């Protein structure tokens, strides 16, 4: 029940992070080679290409209310560029180890970064990028951080320690810790966006995707079928589907009501690493990225 069309594919070096601009028809990509790119996926014309560092850049988001992109790299630094002027406007060492994930608060001037240093950190760009809090307690690399879109005073961290921790700004330890049973770790965590379900979702190298009710703390469903590490899984914001991507080279679209697979796509770009949703979706791979239209 889903007409998947190809919008824009671009060959490049390995794409580790990806994000959609909320009002311009752009995607940001952050590459293994240290370059970051902004592309207009409608005109298929590059808007910016910047060599940021010599190391991988794994995390990248738009902060469109400031005309920014924010990126985090394996050289331990967070950098911000104004995409209208092209200029770097902030640059600081954020962690003493790799940055895996950056999340931006939807209404407040807060950024979270998750790191191989076992922490999440909260930065305030209206307080000279002050470190406002460090969230400690995970036992392995923090792979993914996400605000709860229904209450962004809380957020989740997914970690190779096999847990998700849900935290509140200004509170010392987690609201709660979810033990996932994904014994090879958690690579990704995402929240269901709409009010009807208090659900979250996790992806693992153990080849499973798990859906969680964060109120009951129970596992609602397990989605299996990928044949290698599952890099991500997310709920689509407007369609009743889940989209996952794997080192098996496939994207899978799952029915979010039935928890069964609907489509498996091999877009021919080798391993999948990252995802964004705008009914556009975009994913980064070993050999470039693709933007797809669903409806």
């Amino acid at each position: 029940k889903l007409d998947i069309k190809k919008t824009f594919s671009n060959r490049s070096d390995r794409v580790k992070g990806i994000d959609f601009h909320p009002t311009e028809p752009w995607v940001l990509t952050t590459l293994y080679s240290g370059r970051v790119e902004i592309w207009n996926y409608e005109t298929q014309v590059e808007v910016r290409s910047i060599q940021v560092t010599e190391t991988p850049v794994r995390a990248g988001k738009f902060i469109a209310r400031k005309n920014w992109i924010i990126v985090g790299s394996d050289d331990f630094r967070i950098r911000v560029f104004n995409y209208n002027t092209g200029e770097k406007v902030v640059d600081f060492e954020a962690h003493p180890d790799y940055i895996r994930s950056i999340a931006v608060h939807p209404t407040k001037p807060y950024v979270l970064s998750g790191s191989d240093d076992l922490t999440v950190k909260l930065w305030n760009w209206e307080n000279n990028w002050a470190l406002e809090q460090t969230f400690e307690g995970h036992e392995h690399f923090v792979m993914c951080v996400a605000f709860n879109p229904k209450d962004p005073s809380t957020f989740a961290s997914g970690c190779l320690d096999r847990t998700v921790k849900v935290w509140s700004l200004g509170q010392s330890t987690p609201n709660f810790t979810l033990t996932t049973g994904q014994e090879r770790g958690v690579n990704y965590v995402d929240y269901y966006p709409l009010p009807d379900k208090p659900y979250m979702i996790t992806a693992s190298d153990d080849l499973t995707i798990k859906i969680w009710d964060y109120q009951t703390k129970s596992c609602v469903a397990t989605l299996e079928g990928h044949m290698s590490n599952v890099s991500f899984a997310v709920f689509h914001p407007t369609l009743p589907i889940i989209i996952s991507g794997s080192e098996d080279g496939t994207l899978k679209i799952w029915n979010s009501s039935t928890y069964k697979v609907e489509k498996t796509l091999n877009v021919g770009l080798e391993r999948s690493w990252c995802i964004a949703t705008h009914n556009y979706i975009a994913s980064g791979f070993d050999n470039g990225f693709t933007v797809l239209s669903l409806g």
């Binding site: 790799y98 191989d116 690399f141 190779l160 190298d205």
Partner: peptide, 6 residues
Amino acid sequence: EAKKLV
């Protein structure tokens, strides 16, 4: 080490 780097 591959998990950290890839």
